Ligand binder design. Structure first.
Ligand code: X77
Ligand code: X77
Lengths: 306, 306
């Protein structure tokens, strides 16, 4: 029993974190085989963060412009190239702790674990959802850039996020491991701001199923809804529309609990319209949208507490 | 910016987790140097969980009654002994991944990271507070016993919790690494239940300081309070009394923010009496008591956003 925001064990990623320095700027890099990946803004001059031209800044660097430190050991840079908003530094040593890994681009609403790091040293781990507006609600201080997000499946690490910058509301923006930003953000100092966000309906429904699996039914009702009638309510409450594809994704949780998806949607409609009347669901006084259907299946028992 | 429940990186603990089997029961153990620690209830018969006598059950076991598996490798047990509610199994191999470590008994209100494990395989990591009633709000399924809780300071792992059992309300009970239970619980099937809990006042105050450090002051007021007048309100709202010792602990956070402790207590008094008026603090619609003063200092900037 219980239900918590649960990160993946971080050891396989810890063994990949290094420190990258260029000029006076230090940040974190990810060392896999003989390549170190880091944000290209490591080369940005303090004097000009407003209008960097990265091609022009990078051509002025040599391999020995970059210092890479793995713990106490210096790794010699023997090549470098820019890929989108990342630098790929080739080093003289293959990381002996490289795990089985893949690079994947996650979709909005999906979750991943973040290993917050400073100066190449891991500091903390927590779970994040990629918001519909392409930001994450992380916890990051100066120098956290280059920290990574990942999921783990059967000892294969799927890296999906590298941290680049903080936005004015205190939320965080970054790229995939090909260097392509999530969202419309850019790696320079501009007035950019996170767009309007929305609640991840599929995740709320998954978490209501988690509550039933764990033994609680107080919020169910005798009603059903059509998809279109639910979506009229969702629009009013800034929830994402439910689609037939999302209904299909909820199939296994619906089967484990015996609650049809559209019946759970009717329960959610009533909770939105009437509130929770001072009660909790899975310990929470609000509806939670930070757990995917996969996260619920990963964490909950496969046997409902009937 | 940001503020999240943040666990310590788990890799140093992952390298210590093994599987222990006795008879038909399997659970997790902790392998440090040439010793494996695990819950003594691994020897309990399925037929008699109501009234086990562990001395009488253990004398009937030999070293080869115990199977220990580290990944795919079998570790031969060459000795065994009971210490309180733990077994200490001596094995033929010293763990080459043993970190610098200590065993410590934590106090109520303190936090630690939990590495949830099944069959000796780490599954997830999350942060827990030891509640005043000596339980934790974990997330644990059958076979999680022997999972450990820990804090990390300068690469030294302080182990403080080993998981033993789940209580009727779905919360979790366990021991320190000397095998002494937290709380009045016992390792057998009884009617035992968690006692009444209370809110950890010192942690709420620390988290209000975190909110100011991160730039938010909306909940402050022009009033102050005496310790005794605050404690009259605390009793009404099931908050722990504030003590002078706890006031002293808040010294550094008070200095970083310029808010006297008793002035923050007046703010908390008003929040308890009037509620939060539909507003949030650090993203939360409720007052949070799961972060210690140390956790706030660990995670927040050392410079207040004034
Ligand atoms: C060059 C560029 C792209 C403008 C930049 C500058 C600084 C950083 N930040 C580094 O901390 C940092 C930079 N290099 C080493 N560390 C921080 C950051 O985003 N401030 C923002 C201030 C407003 C305008 C854009 C940047 C940061 C803080 C907390 C968590 N995350 C990141 C990130 C990007
Ligand atoms: C022998 C004894 C002390 C009564 C016992 C029995 C079972 C377990 N539980 C094992 O899962 C388990 C046991 N051995 C291997 N796995 C689970 C558990 O506590 N059920 C309780 C049922 C009510 C009465 C006491 C035990 C468990 C589940 C979820 C998370 N945590 C633990 C723990 C202790």
């Amino acid at each position: 029993s219980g239900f918590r925001k649960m990160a993946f064990p971080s050891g396989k990623v810890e063994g990949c974190m290094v420190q990258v320095t260029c000029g006076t700027t230090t940040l974190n890099g990810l060392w896999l085989d003989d390549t170190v990946y880091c944000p290209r803004h490591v080369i940005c001059t303090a004097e000009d963060m407003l209008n960097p031209n990265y091609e022009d800044l990078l051509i002025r660097k040599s391999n020995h412009s970059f210092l890479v430190q793995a713990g106490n050991v210096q790794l010699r840079v023997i090549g470098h190239s820019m890929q989108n908003c990342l630098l790929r530094l080739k080093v003289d040593t293959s990381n002996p702790k490289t795990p089985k890994y893949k690079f994947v681009r996650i979709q909005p609403g999906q979750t991943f674990s973040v290993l917050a790091c400073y100066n190449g040293s891991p500091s903390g781990v927590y779970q994040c959802a990629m918001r519909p507006n392409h930001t994450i609600k992380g916890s990051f201080l100066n120098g956290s850039c280059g920290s990574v997000g990942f999921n783990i499946d059967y000892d294969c690490v799927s890296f999906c996020y590298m941290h680049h910058m903080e936005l004015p509301t205190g939320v965080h923006a970054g790229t995939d491991l090909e260097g392509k930003f999530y969202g419309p953000f850019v790696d320079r100092q501009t007035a950019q701001a996170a767009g309007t966000d929305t609640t991840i309906t599929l995740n709320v429904l998954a978490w209501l199923y988690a509550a039933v699996i764990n033994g609680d039914r107080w919020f169910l009702n005798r009603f059903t809804t059509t998809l279109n009638d639910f979506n009229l309510v969702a629009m009013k409450y800034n929830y994402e529309p439910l689609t037939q594809d999302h209904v299909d994704i909820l199939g296994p949780l619906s089967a484990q609990t015996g609650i049809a998806v559209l019946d759970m949607c009717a329960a959610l409609k009533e909770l939105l319209q009437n509130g929770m009347n001072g009660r909790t669901i899975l310990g929470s006084t609000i509806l939670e949208d930070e757990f995917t259907p996969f996260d619920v299946v990963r964490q909950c028992s496969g046997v409902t507490f009937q």
